[PDB]
């Protein structure tokens, strides 16, 4: 017979499991231990101290992660977006347009 | 300062949208989403002016 119990103390018994293979150079929705986000993971040349986990930059936006299994430093850049615009030579003169 | 204003509670329990979306059900999370919305909108208005 087992006995589960909770109290005003840290919890130190449970089992998670993700172990999902990673993919680089693709707009992917990532979730490392705790933090989450969306981006295109890529290899980097930054140097982390042995105890540090995930880097940062000015204005406090995540910019690097270290995966638990292989201990590698991966950059993070936001997934591409922008605003489309149309060039027209005037309706009366012609019909064809160009797209920027 | 506009960018740094993004991570503020504004009166909501969490400053990240996904946590409110997940950990608590919609019919009550609408209020927290509304609070974040109004805070961010006011910040943007001040910046534009």
């Amino acid at each position: 017979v087992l006995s589960f119990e909770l109290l005003h103390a840290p919890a130190t018994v449970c089992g998670p499991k993700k172990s999902t293979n990673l993919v680089k150079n693709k707009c992917v929705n990532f979730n490392f231990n705790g933090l989450t986000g969306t981006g295109v993971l890529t290899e980097s040349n930054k140097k982390f101290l042995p105890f540090q986990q995930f880097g940062r930059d000015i204005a406090d936006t995540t910019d690097a992660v270290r995966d638990p299994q292989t201990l590698e430093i991966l950059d993070i850049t936001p997934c591409s977006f922008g605003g489309v615009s149309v060039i027209t030579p005037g309706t009366n003169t012609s019909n064809q347009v160009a797209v920027l | 300062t506009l960018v740094k204003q993004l991570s503020s509670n504004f009166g909501a329990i969490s400053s990240v949208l996904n946590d409110i979306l997940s950990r608590l059900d919609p019919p009550e999370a609408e209020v927290q989403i509304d609070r974040l919305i109004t805070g961010r909108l006011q910040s943007l208005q001040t910046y534009v002016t």
Binding site: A59, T61, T77, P78, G82, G83 | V3, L6
Partner: peptide, 27 residues
């Protein structure tokens, strides 16, 4: 010389010392 700037223009350009693509920003 590089580009076509006169020496005073180059001195002015070097003397002046200077965000990026983020969540919603654009330049």
């Amino acid at each position: 010389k590089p580009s076509k700037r006169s020496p005073i223009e180059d001195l002015l350009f070097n003397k002046v010392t200077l965000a990026q693509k983020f969540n919603g920003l654009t330049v």
